Design a protein around this ligand. Structure first.
Ligand SMILES: Nc1ncnc2c1ncn2[C@@H]1O[C@H](COP(=O)(O)OP(=O)(O)OP(=O)(O)O)[C@@H](O)[C@H]1O
Ligand SMILES: Nc1ncnc2c1ncn2[C@@H]1O[C@H](COP(=O)(O)OP(=O)(O)OP(=O)(O)O)[C@@H](O)[C@H]1O
Ligand SMILES: [Mg+2]
Ligand SMILES: [Mg+2]
Lengths: 360, 360, 39
């Protein structure tokens, strides 16, 4: 007569329990190697040998209870066998795992990925990019931030009218203007998580897409990159239905229904990005599926001035105006990425980038 | 009550442990044959039979501990069973393996390859090619070396502003000018390792490509050979999206996102090579994905003079000028490989190659 | 306590060992037929 808690692979606290188990690796006869390396120079690579508990029946001594944990071996199922019938130790373990895991993810953003029909973490948490480090057109980031905050802070108004509680944004523009960087900065600012989804995967179907969109982690963003490349349209639409044009068991109608249909879930934010706004079917970007669409373009006077004052802090304001005037006179259109590269050429050299502005 | 260290196939120190195990093959009842041959002449081939430990339970006598090592048999899992709970002998074994392995790889370069979704070594370490043995245009190798060194030595400046810590270079030119040779020489000079990646493989997908780019060994270079041949573009791009044109489950958008997207890793250097610069999509070679692009071309006066003074050391300087003048007068364009072959015809024969310059 | 040399298929001296084994086929209870014909 005991208690045998069973936690399979498909659990939200699976990572939390794994982290706690790596924390409590002491008193474990079976082990797995946990060495990491950090090269410095001269062939002197630092060693960091440690001990991950191997998938075994290691006996833990938490609170003097001789708790037995077993992880099997690609199907995985962790087991927490105990004595008697108490259920308090399980709650304490879960709470300690939550306290440890959320401590690790502080000031960072967690990136999930689509494995099979489920979301799993993708590497270590990444450092968040400061929002001010990304400079967009005047009064553009503020509008998006305000709209997202208003959507988040008003769930009651949606329910009182029966409107589905969903939203979606689309960003389009020339390559190298700040779409992905702004998305990352916004995710860092809002303390959300990014879920990466690819429409051209070879293991995606309508049912799997619906399941993935239904089971997305809470306090997270769903990102769809280059939705245009997954469906040729427009000129085709005038003759024949929209072909899928790729590898994968997906259809246009399936995606349209999954984004906003009858079985669509609630409290979800979806971001879509493209480079050819004219290659998207009108039914895909109608209101209800894409509430706000914004255009990010080439540099302007204010954008160049702000970029200059950001890359070389402490300089006089006249230098920024001089740089902006010379850049806009020498060339008509320019991308922020090219400006960033040109600045990267002249590291810590103000008044040098103000002279060699020949980049035609 | 013992300690059972388990090291599966997917480990960085797997080769180090294998090398140490081959070093400590004494006192092993089970063996595997380790014969190698070196032909000299007259059908007298030298024999070098030795003893690789077979995948068995050989008992080792390291430090008088009767350590038991078992290698199973395609899935491989090496096991280091010991007595009690000490964990010190594991540290000593790992350190000795590191000392032995890094001793072997001294003055050489290690070439990795993509097996499944993991990097594995490809043959014995290769002898490094001296940098001065590759002669490029005046002030071209120095610029690339300086840029790479500056990128390596300034990680703080990248973090303090938020730019991702990544870089990428592209080399293009006529066939037979020194792309691969210069890449090998640079890898030897920088004491890095080369990872070979083929975009036309039949077992490559977007998720596998992302995983490979995420788990690349540290202090290494990622090489992409003939990126153009894996994606027809340009004239196709004016009508329809970019087709993949090959065998393999890969898409253009997947490669574009993997090279620089949201889930891209940090501290990575990528080299790309092509023969048709005009067959590459503009979005692929935009700044951020390819920071520096350089053109390697046909021979010139200084290049020919340096090559002549390199292949025939000790000759008077006037002979190099005579050879360069005659070569440039007899022909307009000529690849360095043709010059190398013509020199190889006249081995150790200066003033002979300065007369038979008829290679029209 | 013995010595168990293992030579798998992928070895250069595999043919050499096979030829020697065919040479030393005497005192072998188990056999395989080695008949050849010349019309
Ligand atoms: N507005 C901007 N402010 C600062 N840096 C920028 C800006 N736009 C782009 N960059 C920089 O340029 C590089 C590429 O930016 P990013 O990937 O966001 O461009 P993108 O518009 O998403 O391009 P693509 O369409 O190819 O994905 C990064 O180094 C990024 O920091
Ligand atoms: N600049 C050079 N200096 C010395 N040797 C060179 C040079 N360029 C080419 N070679 C020699 O020519 C042969 C081929 O060189 P390599 O493979 O680097 O050319 P490549 O430009 O990469 O050609 P491909 O595009 O076909 O790969 C080698 O023997 C190499 O050493
Ligand atoms: Mg992007
Ligand atoms: Mg080559």
């Amino acid at each position: 007569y005991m208690i045998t808690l069973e936690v399979p692979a498909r659990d939200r606290s699976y990572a939390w329990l794994l982290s706690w188990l790596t924390r409590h690796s002491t008193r474990t006869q079976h082990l797995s190697v946990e060495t990491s390396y950090l090269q410095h120079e001269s062939g002197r690579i630092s060693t960091k040998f440690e001990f991950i508990p191997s998938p075994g029946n290691h006996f833990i001594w938490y609170q003097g209870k001789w708790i037995r944990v077993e992880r099997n071996r690609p199907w995985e199922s962790v087991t927490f066998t105990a004595l008697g019938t108490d259920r308090k130790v399980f709650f304490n373990i879960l709470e300690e795992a939550r306290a440890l895991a959320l401590q690790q993810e502080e000031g960072k953003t967690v990136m999930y990925t689509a494995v099979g029909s489920e979301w799993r973490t993708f590497g270590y948490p990444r450092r968040r990019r400061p929002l001010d480090s990304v400079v967009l057109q005047q009064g553009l980031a503020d509008r998006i931030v305000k709209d997202i905050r208003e959507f988040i802070d008003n769930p009651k108004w949606y329910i009182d009218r029966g409107i589905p509680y969903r939203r979606g944004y689309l960003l389009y523009g020339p390559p190298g203007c700040g779409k992905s960087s702004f998305i990352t900065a916004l995710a860092g600012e809002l303390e959300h998580s990014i879920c990466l989804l690819s429409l051209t995967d070879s293991s995606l179907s309508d049912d799997r897409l619906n399941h993935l969109l239904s089971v997305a982690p809470q306090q997270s963003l769903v990102l769809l990159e280059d939705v245009d490349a997954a469906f040729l349209s427009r000129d085709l639409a005038v003759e024949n239905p929209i072909k899928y044009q790729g590898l994968g068991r997906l259809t246009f109608s399936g995606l349209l229904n999954a984004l906003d249909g009858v079985a669509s879930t609630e409290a979800r934010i979806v971001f879509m990005t493209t480079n050819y706004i004219d290659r998207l079917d009108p039914a895909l970007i109608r209101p209800g599926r894409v509430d706000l669409k914004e255009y990010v373009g080439y540099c302007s006077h204010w954008q160049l001035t702000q970029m200059f004052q950001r890359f070389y802090p402490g300089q006089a304001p006249s230098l920024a105006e001089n740089f902006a005037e010379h850049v806009l006179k020498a060339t008509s259109e320019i991308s922020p990425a090219q400006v960033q590269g040109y600045f990267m050429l002249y590291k810590n050299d103000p008044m040098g980038a103000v002279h060699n502005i020949e980049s035609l």
